[PDB]
Amino acid sequence: ICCNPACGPKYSC
């Protein structure tokens, strides 16, 4: 997961 906006398509929070 990724609790960040920079994650974009990786954002999982």
Swiss-Prot record:
Superkingdom of origin organism: Eukaryota
Tissue: Expressed by the venom duct.
Disulphides: 2-7, 3-13
Subcellular locations according to the entry: Secreted
PTM-bearing positions, type Cysteine amide: 13
Known function: Alpha-conotoxins act on postsynaptic membranes, they bind to the nicotinic acetylcholine receptors (nAChR) and thus inhibit them. Is active on muscle nAChR (IC(50)=113 nM on adult subtype (alpha-1-beta-1-gamma-delta/CHRNA1-CHRNB1-CHRNG-CHRND) and IC(50)=142 nM on fetal subtype (alpha-1-beta-1-delta-epsilon/CHRNA1-CHRNB1-CHRND-CHRNE)). On mice muscle receptors, its higher affinity site is the alpha/delta nAChR subunit interface. On Torpedo receptors, it does not distinguish between alpha/delta and alpha/gamma acetylcholine-binding sites.
Family: Belongs to the conotoxin A superfamily.
Domain writeup: The cysteine framework is I (CC-C-C). Alpha3/5 pattern.
Note: Negative results: shows no or weak inhibition on neuronal nAChR alpha-3-beta-2/CHRNA3-CHRNB2, alpha-3-beta-4/CHRNA3-CHRNB4, alpha-4-beta-2/CHRNA4-CHRNB2, alpha-4-beta-4/CHRNA4-CHRNB4, alpha-7/CHRNA7, alpha-9-alpha-10/CHRNA9-CHRNA10.
Name of the molecule in the record: Alpha-conotoxin SI
